[model samples]
Each structure stands twice: as structure tokens, then as C-alpha cells.
Target: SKDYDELLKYYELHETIGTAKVKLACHILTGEMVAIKIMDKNTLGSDLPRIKTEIEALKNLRHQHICQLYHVLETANKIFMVLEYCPGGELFDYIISQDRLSEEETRVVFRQIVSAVAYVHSQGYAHRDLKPENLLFDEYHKLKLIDFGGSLAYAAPELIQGKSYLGSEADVWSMGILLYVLMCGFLPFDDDNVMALYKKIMRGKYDVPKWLSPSSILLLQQMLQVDPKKRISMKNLLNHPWIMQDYNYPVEWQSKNPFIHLDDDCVTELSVHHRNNRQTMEDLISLWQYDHLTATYLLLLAKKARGKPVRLR
Candidate 1:
């Protein structure tokens, strides 16, 4: 413990929460619980700039759905960030335990997340890494967005590829990913291979689980548009029928019809090189029964068969 321990008492040290060591501490006299994140300066040499950015962004941001930062201290050995204690733990852990959340519950939490993110963007900031692990619930089960260490200037596909992007759009993309996770208890775009995952994200096409409501699917389609410029804005998101609905009755979310895909057949066709001309290949790709995700995969396969470089866009 450092000199600050005189004013704050540490009860437990959480060894795992990203790269930092989090200590559950409380004020000596005030008895207010807080989370103290300690980062070693030596270990975070290149990450110093990101740490500073988080501190700067968090210090000024105050919202109901955003985690509160109490203070920041830097010393010769370490940097300390005092954050609000979330007794309910990470949202990721909660969802993992439940497998998936109900539509009503998801909407309740998602709306808060969107409100927080919208506020963050309005303040000229972006939380580039918007995932379940970065969201936490309070003792009251109110969700709050946390972890700004990996935030970026923008979040669009171009920005993700090292180009300029609108911070708002980037955040929206992340929210779209977040929503998919909340509804399905899995990532919309994920693969064991890193490059494959990158390609999936670039294509911006994913299957919506049949379990989700029609309105929810519509909202997801609008948010996850491949062209970030065409993606729905925060104002529209708030006004969307799914989010605006005030039904108190339990909404039946389970899809009666099962989802099926012909990805294997499409891949098989591409492998056989059945089509000779560009028009024939294009027509086959366009005849898919599924969403854009299937088409994107087939196109990639077609490109591979021709020995051409696969372009995500």
C-alpha cells in the first residue's frame, strides 16, 4: 500500500480484470467503497498515452449509465485510477451465467448502454472497445459502461483499418456488436482465426438469431449496415419501435421457425469452379437464400478459387 492507504483501506485485490490489478477499497473515514486500478509504469511503457487519454476522458464524463471516476494518481512506480465499485460485477459474467437474456431485459440494459454511448460521443469521445466485459451492473442491477483504456478517435470500418472515421459511427458499430451478444450470448462475427474474424467484421454481415424479435432484427440490420455512413444514428435508434415500445407483458422472443443456411453448398459450388464467366459466378452468389453474410462468405470462396486477393469491401 502507498500513502493513499492512510485515507483508503484495501479489503481485497482482484488479480484479473484486463491488464490492471484492481483493488476493492473503501475510504477510511467515509466508508465509501471504490475500485482502485493500479498499473505499473514500467509494464505500461507504450500504453502511457492510452492511460492518459482514459483519465482525461473519464474525469470529465458524468452520466447515470457511465462508470464514475473518482480520482487519478501517478507516482514513480505506478498509476492509480479510483473508480466506482460495481458490486453486481461485469455484464459479461452475468450473461454467461444466464446463457442469454430475455428481450425485455436486453432492451432495458441496451437502452442504458446506448444512452451512455450517445452521451460519450456527444462529449467528443468514443469507446472503441464496447463489449460485455466493459459493461458492469450496480447493486441495483442498473447497467453502466466502463473501461475507456481502449477507446479510439473513431470506430468505423475505415478507422478500424487505420483511416479516419466518425467517432459516433464507430461507437454505433460496437453497439451493434454488443446487442448481438446480448441477444444470442455469442459474437455476431467471430472465428478461431484472427484474419477470418477481421474479414467477417469488414464484411459487416451476420446472422440474427431466430430467438430475437422482428423489431429487434430490424434494428440490428439498420445498425449493422456495412456502410457506416448508412448506419442508423442515435436519434433514430432512440426513436426505433423496438426501443420505444412500452409493453409491460412478457414478450415471447423464441423463434418458432429454425434458421437454416446453405453455406456448405455455396462453398462446394465455389470449390468445383462450376461457373466459368463473371456473370454466372455473380448470379450464383446473388441467388443465396440467407442474408448478406452467406453471400460474403461465398464471394470470398469464389475469389479464392480464382486465386484473387479477397477484398473485404
Candidate 2:
């Protein structure tokens, strides 16, 4: 169609950071910047629909915190999704750069993320992937939810076909994980072993750090509950004490115990190491591979830039 031609003519495309897709970051004629993700169907079966669904979800969504799509192009070889460009980088990097946020700062950003998630649910989409790395901020330092490759219809009357159902509560669970990291500087249920981490997350066995207020801990407890029925969604989070409180506190108030501070310090150091690991990844990318998937590498750098230098205990 003429519309597709208009998109291709103006939008110069490139490969995304990972996977076998291309992304359009700008419209050459107008100089408008947008993110474009492309996929080759030969490599992905039935996944094209998921991408289209996410693009549609973003297109219909208009929120201060959620990223938006300007256009979507479907071709026999690939799918192009043009979206907003966020410069502030991923939430994971911001947390790393600060080593950790002051509880006050964390609360402010956390509210923004929750507010966005609330909006996402209102729109009937579930962001199945809600990790820190997936959250981005624009040049204005405004957070925009990005990377909806894993998003789905949470409110669909029919169950997700073939795929097991993950409701909007999943997004809240991710927000809870973000909150836990902001307060404690690490994931409560994480382990080097992917299966172990999944098991812990499913079991909700990770201990909440004491530095977190009991009320706040309770909020995360509700969100991270393994049973979907027991899980807290955005509606409940809006009324939680941790979210309702407006007072600012020193980031360290919760880490009073000497041991707690030490633990925080150790995690801060680990955050820095992640930065180093990312640089190595870039080198690997440059030497061996050629493609748009490289955008993922850019995301890796983006996170390092956003993360703060770790402080010693």
C-alpha cells in the first residue's frame, strides 16, 4: 500500500539489539526519530502476531509513562514497528548508576512505573516482560515503558491461545521486583541458575530486606505472591502505604544495621561489575556479528550509563 511505501521511504531501518530483527530509529526526510523492530518469519513462527499485538497495544495506548507507536509496517520479509525513542536508558541502569536510589527518589520513580502499569491494565494489555532492563526514559528524563515483545492481552475474554495465560498481575509482580531492587539493591529471588531463580520466584521464597518498611514489604509480598489469585494488581498498589507516602527519607534509613549496610555495599559493587561485563559484550558484538540485533548491545550500554558508580559501605 502507499502507506507502507511512505514508511519505508522516510524511515531508514537497522537491526535491533538482539534477535534477527531490524529497527527503524529515524525518518530520514523529517528527521523524526522512532524505534522500529523487524522480524523475519522464517526464523520465527507465529511470533509475528505477538509483535503485532504489542505494537497495536502501544498504538492504542497514550500515557505519559508508556511508550507509543507512530506506525507499523508489515511486509513479507519483516514487520516494522516505529515507536518513541527514550534517552534516559533502562531502569536497571539507573538503579545501577546510583548503586541504589534514596528511598524518596525510588518512591517517586516507582510511582511513575506503577502509574504507567495501571494505565496499561486500564488499556487491557499485560506486559509479560517487566524487568528493569525493559523500562526506559526519554531525553526529558521521563520514564517510558519499552520492549513489549512479551506483552499480551490480559483482559481478553478468551484464554491466550497456545500460550499459558499471564494476567495484568504479572506486570505488578515485575513492579514489585523493581521496588525490591530499589530498596535492597538486588533481586530477592535471583540466583545464577535460571531455573533456580524461576523456582524461587514461583515459590515467593525470597526474604524481604528489613530496611524496607513493614508496610512496603507487605506490598511487595502481595504483588509477588505466586498464586495469581493472591497477587496484588495495579489497583491495589495505588492504595498501598509505600505508594501513598510522600515524605522523603535518606536512602539509607532502612539500612541501619551494620550488616545491612554491608550487604547494600556488596550489591552496589556487583552492579558496577555488570557495567564492566557489558563493555566486554560490546567488544564481542563488534568482532563477530553484523546486524540490527546490535540495538540490544546499545541497550546494554544505555544501562551502564544510567547506573551509578557503586559506593563502598
Candidate 3:
């Protein structure tokens, strides 16, 4: 579709990772593994400009929990996105193996998810789709959110009821489903048919496991409230008893860092990797640019995170 300048040359394609949609590839420039997602141009015809806006927003969404979008490429009939590679796999797989997670572990994982969700909401964006499958884990075992979509099992009741609702508000409902899954190894609402599933969601009914703490159950009810009006708001959710529990994990998280600092090491690496010098590399990555220099810097930064002992922020 296009001529190669540095196009495919920078990445060494390995075996297909899992589904054919993605391939496990290592950046020959940096030797860091990354997930390359391939998509056809057909389904992307909606407000082509709008899709660009969404991807642009995703690139600027700098947070520890959100997966990084390093770069984008296009062909005549296809588009490719270079994404952060989460070696620890999906939260769904983790649950399947462990059967269920301890509350202590759930607190750590759920808090990380909340941190990212709250950060996204503050940015005036809503992750309409959040599910166990959308949540991935880094080497540190912390949860990282992938490109935002709402799965049917994790969707809010408002959609089934035809009631207009805010995306962020509905986000709360999905968080409830996530919390439920973390505590129990399975989904709260499941049916073999579409009609039955829709009815279950519209009714907003699910059985709570007796093992959950009273506080957790209470918070779950508020978040899963049938009426959007009664749903727990993000503000209240942060202060909820369940969320406020001691973050007994070995790491610490305070207010989202308001200041961005220059990483001399990453800049030096990027300078050496590209034709640009240290100063030029810094300038390009500090702001934003869709080029190999920026992409290499991102891969280097993620590599730095993997070496850390705590949250990647």
C-alpha cells in the first residue's frame, strides 16, 4: 500500500501473538516487544475525522493504567496501531486461573483501574467499554486499561432500557461489574440468548455472593443501581468504604502528578537511535509527533517502567 522509508523495517515481526488481529513483534530499533494491531479500513468509515480524534485523544491519555498507543500506520485497505505489550495477560485469564482473587489483591487491582478511569473522566472522556477482557496486566501485575469499549456482559442497564445516560455515569455501572468479577470468578449477568440477556440487564438483577463483605455489597448495589439517577457517581465512589480500604500493597500512589519532568536517559537513547540529536529528540517527544523517533521514545519509556518496582507513573 505504501513505500517503506522506515516503515516495516523498524519492527521484526514474530509469530502471530494470539488472535490473528494482533501479532507479537519486537522493535528491531529498541529490541522491545510490542503488540501490533491490524484492522481493515471498512468498519472505520464512521466520521473518519471522528476516528482520528479518538486516536489522537488516546495518544495524549498519559496515565499509568492506560495502555500506550505508540504509533499508527496506514495502507490502502488497512490501518495498524502499535500498542503497549502487557506480558502478564488479561484480567480474565488471571481470574480463570485463580478461580477468584482475594479482596486484598482485588483492592490493589481495582484501585489501579479506578485511578485510570478517574483520570480519563477528568480528561472529559468516558471509557464506554470496560470489562475483564479490556483490562490487562503489566509486568508489575498492575491493571492497565486497553482501548475503551463496552462489552455486552459489562454494559449498563440504561442501554437496554433505552434510557439516555451519560457515558461516565454508565462507566460506574461497568466498574461494578468489574468489581463483581474480581470477587467472584464469573459474571453477574449471563444468558444463552440475546433477549434473555437484555431482559436481565433491563431488570438490573444479579445474585450477590454471600462471601462479599457488607461494605462491598453496599457499594456494589449503589454502582449497579437500576436507575441511572441512583447510580454511584465517581466522586462518591472514590470516597466509598470499599475503595477507601487500606491499599496494603507494597506500592504508593498519591495525587496524579501534575508536573512532567524530562527524562535525560530516554532522550539520550532516542537521540542515539535516530538521526536527531538529544535536544531535537526531546523536543519531538515532549510535545507529540507521529514518527519513528516518538515511537522509539515511547517503547523506551515503557521499558523503563518494566524495570521499576511500583506503578509505572
TM-score per candidate, in order? Answer: 0.72, 0.65, 0.85
- 1 against 2, candidate with superior lDDT: 1
Candidate 1 regions exceeding 4 Å error are 1-19, 150-156, 247-313
**Tens digit per residue, CA lDDT, model 3, 1-313:** 4523345777877767655288878877667888887776777675556666778878667777888888787666676778888888889999999999988789878888888888888888888888888888988887788865425888888866767889888889999988999999988899998789878977878998889988788888898987888998887776667787774332232323222665667777666556578767667777766566567767766667558321111
For candidate 1, lDDT tens digit of each residue in 1-313? 5744422332234434544787776533223456777788888678789778777787657676787666566666787776766788889999999999988889888878877887777777888778888898988897778888533211346655777777778778788878888888988887877667767777877877778988788888888776877999887776577876764433222222111333344444443454345445445555543222332443344345446654432
lDDT of each: 0.67, 0.59, 0.76
State in Å the error of residue 113, model 2. 1.3
TM-score of 3: 0.85
In the predicted model 3, the residue pairs found to clash are 129-149, 129-150
Error of 3 at 66 (Å): 0.8
Best by TM-score: 3
Per-residue error at 157 for model 1, in Å? 2.7
For model 2, residues 1-313, the per-residue Cα lDDT tens digits are 4435645664566546534454546555334456765556667787767776776666556566777555555666666665667657677878888877777788878877877777767667777677777778888877788777532211111122233556686566667667788877787666776556545555567776657776676777787665666777566567667777784332111111111111333233434544545445445444422122222222322334447333321
